[model samples]
Target chain A: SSRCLVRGSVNIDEFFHLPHIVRPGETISSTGLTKRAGGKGANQAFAVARAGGQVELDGAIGDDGIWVKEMLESAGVGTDKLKIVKDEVTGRAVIQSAADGENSIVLHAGANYYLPTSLATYTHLLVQNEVPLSSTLAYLTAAGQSSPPLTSVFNPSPMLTPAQLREFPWKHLSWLIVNEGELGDLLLAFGSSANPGEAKEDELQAKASAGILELHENDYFSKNVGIICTLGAKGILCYEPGKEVGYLPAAKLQNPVKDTTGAGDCFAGYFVAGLMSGKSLQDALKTCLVACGICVENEGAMESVPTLNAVKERL
Target chain B: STSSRCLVRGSVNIDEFFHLPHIVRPGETISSTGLTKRAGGKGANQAFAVARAGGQVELDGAIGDDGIWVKEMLESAGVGTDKLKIVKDEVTGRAVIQSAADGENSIVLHAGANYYLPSPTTSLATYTHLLVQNEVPLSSTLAYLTAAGQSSPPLTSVFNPSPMLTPAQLREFPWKHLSWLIVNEGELGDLLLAFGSSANPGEAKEDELQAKASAGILELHENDYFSKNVGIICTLGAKGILCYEPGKEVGYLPAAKLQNPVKDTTGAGDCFAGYFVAGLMSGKSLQDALKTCLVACGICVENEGAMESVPTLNAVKERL
Candidate 1:
């Protein structure tokens, strides 16, 4: 068993659908109201479990968040390290649909304040930005510093500011997974060229490919090259210190794009799980695309991630 | 003004409001502008209204340790907190208020500690007035009505059946013991059906008060029995309010003019209920009290939030 410990946060998502704007001082009724469990850390854990990977989610959950724990369990994720805070509420992501068809989110941290511990036995530690920076740093520090030094996978989704990103001890990390924009951010944070996006469509990939080569040439602040960048629908770029395996194209869409909400998280989850299961780095990256292809074919986040057999069948 | 204290028995909730550009649809995830935690719940806001209106009031209900801050907020606003019972091992009530950019909102409430109300043991005679709403379990409200029925000189028992009961459930409630029953147009219809009245319902718009006022009296009437003691006060938002008592001509008071644009309507009704009871406690005439409450509610709507929006008596008096 890989014993991948996913350290993160859990949230109760409250979604409301309105027909029109609620003007000041008048009472109007919402057309729909829905509640679900959501959080980036939790989503990745679910992704790993659904992909038939061994994973445990360790995070703080308020007394009201037991259902979130149960949902994780149903997906085959372990919850041995869950914190059930008394007299508290789980974190909440209140998402509302807007007139522009965009989502406006108000997030409450609630009981998500957490600390990471007992790292001696884990083979990997996965984290993201959906949790408190303090806790994310705690997991990164300890997991990267342990005697056997577990593989610390950092997916800085919901990207932090440049100054904040520069603060992390990147040299100690084992692997970094990022979406197209976040990779651009990584390059910009390293004092590289500011323009990660160019005007020409073909040159966009040229800039991204050049950005990764520049990071390695400059040693990325003395950090070794272990990066996986999901280049949107185009493909994914896999790199090691000396060799560039180049872009591995994703599977053709068997279905139309419904939502790309959690595509990156799904890609990150399956990549780490594939590696944990002993697939080679290039092979792992290949399977990740197959997983995300199945993802955008559906809507939502965690629910959209395909199972191991499901992805295999697609392959 | 009399300093007599009124007793308020109702639910208090931690209202978590999510401000969104638009509400989400089924199975959709939309982001929100942000989340705000505010003190809310009919009973607590009602208590805030009375105290803000310069009337002393004691609030009674169930709260857990998690609800202490809400209790403290009321105390800071001058509501009597000695009557609130702190329940063990229960979450304080919570209201998930999903407010959309379009001014539409939907509320889902979890009546955690509110379900475990500690019945009032004190002599009902001590308070000059008592007010309650339908947020708590009816058994609690029923006990209150039953107790008020036995008090000497009688406690001016009032009820606001919001989040109304089914007609069958309404029939079981002790309506005869009520000195005042406040409701809106829709709730008035429910109460009418509870009494088996099938007369065509009337409206409460600006020009239609008289017929609605008369029918309200007729439908809920039993000059010698059912509604002989209770006076029905129907609150109309923009138009005004209608008051009906047996054997007396129905009275209507035009809603007070708004001094400012409406901001949020969350606490307006509670503001109205709280101030009305406060008025009657101070020995104001029914017409004067309702007028003052209209002013108070008008002030409430011009502000944001529930407990936070209640107007001070000075604001209402200045408007008057």
Candidate 2:
């Protein structure tokens, strides 16, 4: 309960590289194929563990994911809490990336989402939107109601429905890390004026700061919920109830970004990892920016998240 | 090398691979680079080599539904496939090979469809050359040998007994009908021991064991093989080629110098056998045939994979 724990989903990702996306009626041979462990939750856990933060993950994987469990454990992510469901295939995603940068994806939540709601206690809980909202809500609600108190961070990704979005106990969270569009969706769902979705790059933080203040003051939240609004290329914006908004532009990468697939999850996980390392928000945000910047410069989710020294070297 | 068609009868199977850091020992489970599957069987790869080296050849072997792609590759390479036997009940033969970056790999194989080759029913009189390997059922291979033996002009048979059989097991084969028998230096002792005498062809101290192989070639010739042109061709990896025939003296041809790094040696021997027989069938002088075989394999080792690595005649000619 004292350690950073992750409650999320695990997915087996298969990627095929083709000259161009195969059309509906066309059959094309891919130039290459790659398989990796992925899922919003799994990626965050992988990122957090690789950043040298002690972490454990709570999830379910079918028999087919025995190898994935082995892979995660080999990378130092504790999988003792991972459930191995029988007679079910592992959740998976098939992605096809065209040479021209266009892509297509098909996802199936097999064992990843087909699990009974199980809860865990931790000092810091990191979670994502890949699993059922019921389970996520349970974890947050339980953690939020704890006496010793749990610092929980949530990233409602892939943009949930308004009805699904309403299930969140926003006050239960210590941090809500989200991209600008997701932030806008959240504000719009709760009836707020500062929807940052259409805000121009220059006006992003201005509108998000308004959104964060509104988010902070709401009976919708009790403890001043700190919000970290990620602007991607524009940079990152951080806001707390009593403090001035913290703004850090995107860290410059040594090379051009290749794949942005797991960049956001990386940033979210690294911030939590930096927190466990006892880093201040100022240093952690910069480190998270640099880490996530290094992330976009590569491919895949778990593999793209750089380890501590690789990030700290640039820092 | 071409003219009289060489009918190939042997195993055709898929080669499945996983590149690893090192060979995994018993009870140790390790992950690898990727699963790589390709067409590879002694008969198929050798046939691929025959056609790739500009020779007319027909390949006859059993392949299951899973190996239609192997048949497709052979046919695309101009290998005659009309005589290929399709086995419905068995899967194609396959090798699960753990390929390491260093020059060490461990492998396991399943006979599969290769074990189900039924003897051919047609007359073998038309074919002047026949190449067969030990990967198929021994009975099927024997049936063909017996038929070729009774033909009007019997096949100029070249038998490659790889995955070396025990001396006792090989002694029962119809070697009396064989025109040429090819064995590597390591395999020389297996063949020699089968004929009632044996010698160590190095695993070598290089020079000392090489002379043993050189002298062992003459000993290999004395064994009774009642064919018109009885001979033995012994191959020593990176050492050279050795042979003792009806008219030629026991000789050693040091392996050709490599101009580039040797990437893989997977099908080098099959490549040599395919080109050697094709060259001799095309009437190249013995020395020239041996030289062509060396160069073809030289190109083969420079590439990756088995059948795919067998270079085209133009590639061989270009290297020359």
Candidate 3:
């Protein structure tokens, strides 16, 4: 009954090939449309599932009534935990690929627009009539209390609105995974630990330039937070309360950079798996390194997600 | 002004098509092995048909500044787009047709820029006559037709295929502004029903029957509303022809019973309108115009897609 729960948008991605980066006015004809099941949540779920992790996904995808459910189920990701709502055109991303290992994309919100902010508010069969709630909450509540470290990593990607952001019980989060951008916002809102001008603190000066810096520093910053900032090519930075900060350099990639679509999410999953195992600081860095090494080797963000064997092969 | 001599007004669309068999069941999922996009619209089609059929036409349509595919499509069809207007607000319009077995088709349309088409200004100045359809907005069509009705040479021949026109829009214009009301039987039936005409497709009195019999409609029009209008053509599938000149006992043209198997009937009516217009523009007799139009349509249905079937002048002549 234990599973990795991925909570985020469910996207349907369409892949297309471009002879080169397309200009605004020029039109180029491609051979056909290729639809792939993708989204940060599903992508992370599948990454875990394929890497020998039992997982369930919670999010909304259009009831496109296509093979979407089958695709996820066949990959061993639990579908019974998903919310499929009626809508036209599932959320999709148009990924443009070129022969030279370069790409660009445009995403359409589509049915993702219909996804409710909080799964906990939805009516589920298991919920008592007196206090109805979605099965996701019941499932998460049960899973959150389990032995063998009932760890949960919430990315809250694409910057969910403050209300949506506030809904998740961050205080109860066993571990939080987010990029520097998200961390900056959360820390800014919570107020910075660094005072404005005590000997001109360099870290405080750097924090001042953050875009959503105030939200993270003033309001949302939690001392118990296990934060990781993923900088593409520049490597990763992990910060834990009252602990020495850890830094991991980018591992050499097998192939040149194609599309940097899922690198950040892959890093999140890698770090999660590292934490799940009793790996040391150096071992955790290597775990994330193997995960990333497997990513940049492939084309699409999802396509590059590393399998256990792929990650091990990278080592 | 180069735009003064002739003006072509219509839709510019990116046509997406799915190829299938003769018949399709109600519930089915069909995958298109190949998907292609091309330019199409009633106004664009007729303009292309005219240019392809050996007539001169200056094309005017809404185009996005970012794409020249539509422009390329028209220019290839022999249309002169020297006056083609580019609109900044919207993407080019789009049409999707599914051609099933036996050449049957179902189409879905997105009337993009055509939804907010601007009124004809300089393009109206030199127009001998304007060819209009419902592909663009009703307001734009009404304005152009009204201007054609007021000018010195006065737009002599206006082709109106009440494209998706509602009763309210039809009510905006004087019926006399329509030199030619080129519409199919369904639209005409809708019009008749709206005007409170009791004569159903099958119900008619003895005089009405006699009127229908001698209605001078050469083809399918022979059975429908020919007696009420001077020029009428109700396209009848496999009944083997177009009907025309119904009100008078003269000028009726019968369609040739050509045995070219029907593939898909998409764009057949437009082909009829185009050829009919071509014939009228050529000063052919009403009967002769209907014949040529029928031949053009006959050749059109023989081909697979809509605009693809528009017969060249020589192709039409060979069939005749």
Candidate 4:
């Protein structure tokens, strides 16, 4: 059995169908109406579980977050880690999918604001100011030798700093997954002038693969750190000490293309699951890339993800 | 002024709203952007359309115990519901209105307590005018019109909304008792073609329009109603009103030009009827009444919400 943890934002999306969005001044008639359930954090976590991974979601759910727990359980993901905050309305996203497949979205941050790290005792009175509990725990633990060597995968989808990133114990990290946009975001956060996306395709892959390996060679975590970079469509790149840097090409999808929402999360979940199952870094990255191709075909984040059987069958 | 009392046998309904995107495809999970609940019964709405246009209307209908909102909506429009019946099994009728952004709407109605209204009976002789819409049962509408026909002073005017009346019921009416007959372009065309008065039931051309109007009245007069005394007013929305009086040149009311920023045309035809009756009861000539009806309709589409926007006689004059 493979066990993994996912900590991310959760939201309830209110969807509306309209014949056409009203122009700035035109009043149009709507032809029909319905409401349904959705959330990105739940979407991604369930995408992983549906793909045949046993994962516990560590996310905050609001009191009024409708059908979220049910949605997650139905997807085969465990809800034990979900902390329901009292008096807090669930986070919500408003979405309108046009006939042409274009969609307008507005996100409301609700309970995610109150999730504090484990080290920080949460006060009900100050629920709104609690930080991301998991990230803070990983950070404080990485810095102390007394902390457990329970390997961590740093996916600093940062609202935190590169300072925050570096402060986490690199020596105890099992892997790092950062995409091109995340690399740029990390650079800006650190005041570093890195243009990861602007590099030549071949050079970009080299910069990415090398950056991960070099991060492992840093004085802080030279012997134990492994780094991974997901370059959507281009595939997955991995580097760990004492091994040749490896690259896995992206998998071929069932259809040409319509939407691209869950491809990255599928890859990340697969890679983490592979690591927990003790696959070598090379095969894990390969399986992760194959899983991603399955996600890009169907539309929406969770709806497109394929199961592990889907991955193996495709392989 | 000819004081005609109004008898409306019709439906009472609540409406629910849904919004859909263009060219709705099947099996797609489109979200509803907004929802609304409002009072909307075909019978009630039409009555409001007419009453607000300035007719004194007494509604003969049924309402459920839970129908307070719908009752209030009609009462606010000054429709007298004293004659309305109540039922245990049925609720007030309800409708679902799904509107597109372009002001187009798709409607589905559920007949509730409206199905239980008794047949129409005459108001006192003080009521010289009678207006009928298809909201109540055909039998009921005919009974109401029959009672109006037998009034001591007699109903000097009658406006019949074909509603679901069978040809036999229509032929049974003593139309010879009427002073003015109001109908829509489509209904008049159908009636004209049904009696073999016209070649087909298509849109009536200007040259053929008067012939169709005359054909409509002729068929009714031929019925036991013997309604030759009536003048027929056919509404042509935005084009104007058309009047067909026996032994006279066809009369016309050119449409009044007005800008309508938003439109809720739910009860437009009824409004036209109400205003036309108001003009006739106030003793305006046929041509003058036709003009006044158009003005009343013009004021209706300028605002949003049904019946809420219907103008009174003073407002109609103010617009003029």
**Whole-model Cα lDDT of every candidate shown, in order:** 0.78, 0.78, 0.57, 0.61
| DockQ ranking, high to low | 1, 4, 3, 2
lDDT by residue (A107-205, candidate 4, tens digit) is 445676564534122110001012364544544353233333444555555335556655554555555567766655555554455557576787888
Report the error of model 2 at residue B90, Å: 2.7
Segments in model 4 whose C-alpha atoms lie over 4 Å from true places: A1-315, B1-4, B16-37, B53-55, B85-89, B97-106, B117-126, B156-180, B196-198, B204-230, B246-248, B259-264
**lDDT tens digits, residues B227-253, model 3?**
233355555444434344434433334
Error of 3 at B180 (Å): 0.7
Name the weakest run of 10 consecutive residues (lDDT summed) in model 4 chain B: B22-31
Give model 3's DockQ, 2 decimals.
0.02
Residue B181 CA displacement from its true place in model 1, Å: 14
Superposed on the true chain A, the predicted chain A of model 2 yields a TM-score of 0.89
Candidate 3: regions farther than 4 A off: A1-315, B1-6, B19-36, B65-67, B102-104, B118-123, B199-230, B240-247, B250-261
For each candidate in turn, the TM-score is 0.62, 0.53, 0.49, 0.48
Clashes of each: 22, 0, 36, 34
Give the runs in model 1 whose Cα sits over 4 Å from its true position: A21-28, A99-102, A114-116, A197-200, B1-14, B17-39, B47-272, B281-320
Please give the lDDT score at residue A248 for candidate 3: 71
Instruction: Identify the runs in model 2 with alpha carbons over 4 angstroms from their true place.
Output: A1-315, B118-121, B224-229
Per-model DockQ against the true two-chain complex: 0.09, 0.02, 0.02, 0.03
lDDT of 3 by residue, A20-66 (tens): 54332122333334567777766776666656566666655665624
